[PDB]
Amino acid sequence: KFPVVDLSKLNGEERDQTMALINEACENWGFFEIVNHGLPHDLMDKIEKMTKDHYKTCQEQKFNDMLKSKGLDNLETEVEDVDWESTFYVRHLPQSNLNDISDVSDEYRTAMKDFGKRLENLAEDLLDLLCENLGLEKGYLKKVFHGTKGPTFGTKVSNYPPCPKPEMIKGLRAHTDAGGIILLFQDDKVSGLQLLKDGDWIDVPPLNHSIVINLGDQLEVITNGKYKSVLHRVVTQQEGNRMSVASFYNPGSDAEISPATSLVEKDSEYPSFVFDDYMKLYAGVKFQPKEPRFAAMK
Amino acid sequence: MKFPVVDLSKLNGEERDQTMALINEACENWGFFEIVNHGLPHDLMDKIEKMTKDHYKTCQEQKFNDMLKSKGLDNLETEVEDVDWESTFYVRHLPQSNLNDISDVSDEYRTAMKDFGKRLENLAEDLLDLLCENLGLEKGYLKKVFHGTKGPTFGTKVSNYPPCPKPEMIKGLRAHTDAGGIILLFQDDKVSGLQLLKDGDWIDVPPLNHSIVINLGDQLEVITNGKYKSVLHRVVTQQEGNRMSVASFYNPGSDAEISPATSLVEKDSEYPSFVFDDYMKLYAGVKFQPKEPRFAAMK
Amino acid sequence: KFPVVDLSKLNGEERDQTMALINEACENWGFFEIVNHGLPHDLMDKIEKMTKDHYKTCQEQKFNDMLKSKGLDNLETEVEDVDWESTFYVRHLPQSNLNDISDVSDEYRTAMKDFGKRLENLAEDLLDLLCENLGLEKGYLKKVFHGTKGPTFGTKVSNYPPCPKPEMIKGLRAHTDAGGIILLFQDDKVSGLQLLKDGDWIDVPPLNHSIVINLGDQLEVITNGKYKSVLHRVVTQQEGNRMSVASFYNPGSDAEISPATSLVEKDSEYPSFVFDDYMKLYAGVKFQPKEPRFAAMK
Amino acid sequence: KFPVVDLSKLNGEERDQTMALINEACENWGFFEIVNHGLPHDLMDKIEKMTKDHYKTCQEQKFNDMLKSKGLDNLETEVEDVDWESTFYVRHLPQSNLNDISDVSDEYRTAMKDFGKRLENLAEDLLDLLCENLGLEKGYLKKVFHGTKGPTFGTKVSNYPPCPKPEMIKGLRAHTDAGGIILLFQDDKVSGLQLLKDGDWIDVPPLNHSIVINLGDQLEVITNGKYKSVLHRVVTQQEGNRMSVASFYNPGSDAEISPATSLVEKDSEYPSFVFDDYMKLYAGVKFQPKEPRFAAMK
Numbered sequence A, C, D: 001k002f003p004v005v006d007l008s009k010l011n012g013e014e015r016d017q018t019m020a021l022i023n024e025a026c027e028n029w030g031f032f033e034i035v036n037h038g039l040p041h042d043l044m045d046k047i048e049k050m051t052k053d054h055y056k057t058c059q060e061q062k063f064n065d066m067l068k069s070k071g072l073d074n075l076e077t078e079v080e081d082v083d084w085e086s087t088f089y090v091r092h093l094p095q096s097n098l099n100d101i102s103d104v105s106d107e108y109r110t111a112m113k114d115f116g117k118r119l120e121n122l123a124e125d126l127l128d129l130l131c132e133n134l135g136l137e138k139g140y141l142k143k144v145f146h147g148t149k150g151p152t153f154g155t156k157v158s159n160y161p162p163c164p165k166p167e168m169i170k171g172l173r174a175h176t177d178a179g180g181i182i183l184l185f186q187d188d189k190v191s192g193l194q195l196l197k198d199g200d201w202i203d204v205p206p207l208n209h210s211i212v213i214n215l216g217d218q219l220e221v222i223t224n225g226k227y228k229s230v231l232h233r234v235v236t237q238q239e240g241n242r243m244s245v246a247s248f249y250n251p252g253s254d255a256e257i258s259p260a261t262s263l264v265e266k267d268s269e270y271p272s273f274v275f276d277d278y279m280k281l282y283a284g285v286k287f288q289p290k291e292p293r294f295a296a297m298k
Numbered sequence B: 001m002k003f004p005v006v007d008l009s010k011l012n013g014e015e016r017d018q019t020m021a022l023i024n025e026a027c028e029n030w031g032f033f034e035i036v037n038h039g040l041p042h043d044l045m046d047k048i049e050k051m052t053k054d055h056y057k058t059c060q061e062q063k064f065n066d067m068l069k070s071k072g073l074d075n076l077e078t079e080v081e082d083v084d085w086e087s088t089f090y091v092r093h094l095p096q097s098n099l100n101d102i103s104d105v106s107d108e109y110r111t112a113m114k115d116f117g118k119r120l121e122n123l124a125e126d127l128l129d130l131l132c133e134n135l136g137l138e139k140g141y142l143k144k145v146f147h148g149t150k151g152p153t154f155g156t157k158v159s160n161y162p163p164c165p166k167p168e169m170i171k172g173l174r175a176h177t178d179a180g181g182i183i184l185l186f187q188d189d190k191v192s193g194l195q196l197l198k199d200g201d202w203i204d205v206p207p208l209n210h211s212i213v214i215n216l217g218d219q220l221e222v223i224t225n226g227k228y229k230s231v232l233h234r235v236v237t238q239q240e241g242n243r244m245s246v247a248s249f250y251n252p253g254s255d256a257e258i259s260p261a262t263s264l265v266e267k268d269s270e271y272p273s274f275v276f277d278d279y280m281k282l283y284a285g286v287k288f289q290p291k292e293p294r295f296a297a298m299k
């Protein structure tokens, strides 16, 4: 059963049990859903509606332009080198480009700014729960992530349109995320996101007004492997356009990333590096195995 | 943390148990090991090496340079992670040989390759029997699983990794695990390059004169229920030196049924049961992506 | 000005003028277009439509698989030994293989059979006009071409898909045709076929519901050089997929080919041979000079 | 310091810094000189000699004729509506008139033809360097310039003879060039060409065996203002006849010119139009401000 965490149970004497659920999702799933997370359901509903309307208005034509430009009109053999995906990226931190994206509406930009700020505070709240579960001092992960200019925080807004031949192409090929903590607002009707657990692909179930959390490669390093970043993918379907609004809380470019000493006894197998060196490498090898990227930092 | 070198002549004597134990440790903890004092005549190895290197210089080097310019890798500017800096051709031995159909090979190279391949096929089957004994399986178990209808698949990849002006930019061969059963490598004894991933570090598979490098593929990880894992490996380039590689792949037949051996399965396995050719059709397209999704895809 | 022959003008006031124009194209161009040729325009439209749809369904992915098979994905330097071409061949005579091309529909097969029979009749009508212009007896060329089983007649169905760098590769390299008379139904929008005349490449202009005629090597022999087989090529372009349905009316395999004695005063420089010996040679040297093939038949 | 670019440094490890100099000149100067290009110094020396000898034999007459019919022999006060200039034009593409200029010698025409071909290839190589610096796809600008008949390429051969009172008249009044890329072989002793930069007229220094490059109005549109076409003029002097051999690589007449979409964020201030409409208008208003010509294309 996929972990669903009720964050409102942290405000009372059920808080220890909630923390234990968070910790075991972090150790064994790499993913969990959160409900009662404090984000207004009214804000999620308009983010959802304006994301979908901005797709028809602005992204659908770019998407078909892409399928023509790569011959994906007609899928007669398996395509393992492209994602059946429509995306644009919004940067929040350290410097916002929200007011420079030309094709987004005023009210969409205002909703995205509010949504991004609330998710940034929720990311930092979640990192503190991780710290507590890890036996780290409060604020430890936030301070590691800061670097010189503060954390990097952006939002990937994706749609995975219907695919006539889902067997032939993935919406997004299997990978682990490079960063710190990932907070996903996904479609509540159209499924597609899957994680790999114990040798099976497991669906990340659509759930109304929920946020999906998962941990990236940097948290595997800092926890000395105690919390691993898990492989995940998006599969297409013939009917349905799955919406994806995923926010990435990453260390600053010059943050020093290393295994926390209190989590290391035997010499660590994980490297110590500067985050931007990891991200330069990751961009070119995102869909290749994760383990060579750690070795490359030594 | 020393790379395992196994003396196969010590299986013939009082030290056979200690030698078997060493083999089993390499299979569990390295996925690779070198063997010495195997049956292969050192003069046949010297001939194979000599004729491979001369066939590169004579027939492949001009094609390799032409491939460079056709792809614009003659001048390297930024990292290339979708191309291998590699010159290769393939020789199929089983189930059906294509040796007499490679046009650009000499009669003496073709005859030596046929002889070399036959000896390596017999050595592959002897090594599979050592694994069976170490795993507690009946003798011939892995050979029988691999047979399918037409027998095992056996072929040889003959590769050269020529000097690369900028090695930090392109791999000789990107990191992957091998799809098949057991892989037997005769590699350059001077020029290094092959590396395996162990405990979060890339480790050189050291060139060693008249040795054979053994490693296990994805099919043995399934059959042993994860006890022997298929290990990630790559070939790095260098500015000088052309590393030769003659690698033989002993794989199950196309219609072989692959599954975890029942005596190694005390609770539900995380590994699938499938037909080998379905794994291979999938593997061809995703060879340089993670291994674990390929097992999940067989369920 | 590229010769366009109006076959309705044989009926016949300008019939001398039309015949003189046919003769002038045969001597000096080796190519000419015909209009009002009797082929139903609706049959041409069906052939064109089903040819273009059959490419998309059956050849376009085969074509992209061939490109990556041969490395023409990257055209960083000149390719002089490959044609940027998708083709299949249909034999009508003496023995049809129309029923063995498996990925074609019964409607396409029935239309090609009707089209091929009408083009075979037009080929023989055209050969009789050449006979008259040359002063040969009616039916002379048809009788020479017959051999024992009748003429050889087949259709090459080609498409020349768009090429990102057309200056690196030809759709089809310069050559002369080996056979008798060639009747080409080409794309009426996308140009590409060129002939060599007076040291210049001249486009063979797309013209709706027209047939392009050219003379092959066998007619150069029979006419003792009075009508020469002209070099031609197909150039690629970056946008546009030029279709080509080209039918070859050739002598039978065991036909005896020699210069017609009434066209020879001074001893001929052209050989006398059996057609299949010419064709067995031509296959290996099609894109090398034409003149050594005549010498090789002595 | 006026930018001088060594093109031979593109073949090696200094190529990035060379590209950076090119991009800097394109953004901030609109002009740059190139050395070590492909043109043989003996071809430049012969072009220069035969241009100067062609002035004395053929153009000096037409020039004094011009001064007659305009009353410019004596300059009592400023002349702001005529250029103190002797010119004839050579067209290369899409069609050459080189063999139709009556008063040009055989060897001048052969040199002029070889010179023009090398400058046409150098124009296209330079346009690809701009593409790379702009982040556009390789060949982007050449493809935009093509239209139906290919680029327009011609050569303006000018002399600016000595002027008794240079204060009264310009050799060529201040203007921006209408076209794409301009490649100038100018006098290496007699100066005169100036550009306007940061509120100062700056001399374009004569330099042995160099080519002066500048960008026209069409590249400002395509780059959405990132590379502007800058005002330039030729001043006269009392002693010295400055030679000017200027080749203009322009889009084809029916080319569609618009800001490249990857260079546009907010709505562009530049129009989208067909090049020949710009040229019709430019011809009549060449020495008036540039900005109204862009406004006129909307």
Ligand SMILES: O=C(O)c1ccccn1
Pocket: A156, A172, A177, A182, A184, A214, A232, A244, A246
């Ligand atoms: O696009 C991704 O990589 C993604 C999106 C949401 C959650 C995890 N990963």
Ligand SMILES: O=C(O)c1ccccn1
Pocket: B157, B173, B178, B183, B185, B215, B233, B245, B247
């Ligand atoms: O080419 C390979 O994948 C290979 C070759 C030799 C040994 C292991 N792997």
Ligand SMILES: O=C(O)c1ccccn1
Pocket: C156, C172, C177, C182, C184, C214, C232, C244, C246
């Ligand atoms: O494919 C050919 O060689 C051909 C096709 C049409 C017309 C002339 N020649």
Ligand SMILES: O=C(O)c1ccccn1
Pocket: D156, D172, D177, D182, D184, D214, D232, D244, D246
């Ligand atoms: O005559 C011109 O307008 C010109 C000549 C050379 C360079 C720039 N402009």
Ligand SMILES: [Zn+2]
Pocket: A175, A176, A177, A232
């Ligand atoms: Zn992800």
Ligand SMILES: [Zn+2]
Pocket: B176, B177, B178, B233
């Ligand atoms: Zn391998």
Ligand SMILES: [Zn+2]
Pocket: C175, C176, C177, C232
């Ligand atoms: Zn032909």
Ligand SMILES: [Zn+2]
Pocket: D175, D176, D177, D232
């Ligand atoms: Zn100018």
